Amino acid sequence: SRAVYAKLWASTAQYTQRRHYAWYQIWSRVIPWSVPWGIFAMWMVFPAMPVEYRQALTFGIWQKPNIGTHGPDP
């Protein structure tokens, strides 16, 4: 019957939408890898920033290492 053949033909009309859905799925699986690599980027580039920005970005936890040299002069 024409009706059934029409339904079967039309079953795949929306190919592009299904492909967009596929884009969504694979990117959802992939994108969390940005966190490891982001941490490492920041790890490497932290000692390049100004001392003030190092102190700020760590909420004051980070401070200049104390190795027993270059102390104040009376």
Partner 1 sequence: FKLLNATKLYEYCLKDNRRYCMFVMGVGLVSSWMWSEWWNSVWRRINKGKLYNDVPYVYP
Ligand X SMILES: CCCCCCCCCCCCCCCCCC(=O)OC[C@H](COP(=O)([O-])OCC(O)COP(=O)([O-])OC[C@@H](COC(=O)CCCCCCCCCCCCCCCCC)OC(=O)CCCCCCCCCCCCCCCCC)OC(=O)CCCCCCCCCCCCCCCCC
CA distance 41 to 50: 16
Binding mask 9-48 for partner 1 (x = CB under 8 A): -----------------------xx-xx--xx--x-----
Cα 62 to chain centroid, rounded: 24
Contacts of residue 57, defined as CB under 8 A and 6 or more positions apart, other chains included, come to: 46, 49
Select from 56, 69, 70, 71 the one that contacts ligand X (CB under 6 A).
56
| Closer residue to ligand X (CB): 4 or 67 | 67
CA distance 51 to 2: 76
Select from 5, 27, 33, 43 the one that contacts ligand X (CB under 6 A).
43
Binding site for partner 1 (CB under 8 A): 32-33, 35-36, 39-40, 43, 62, 65-71, 74
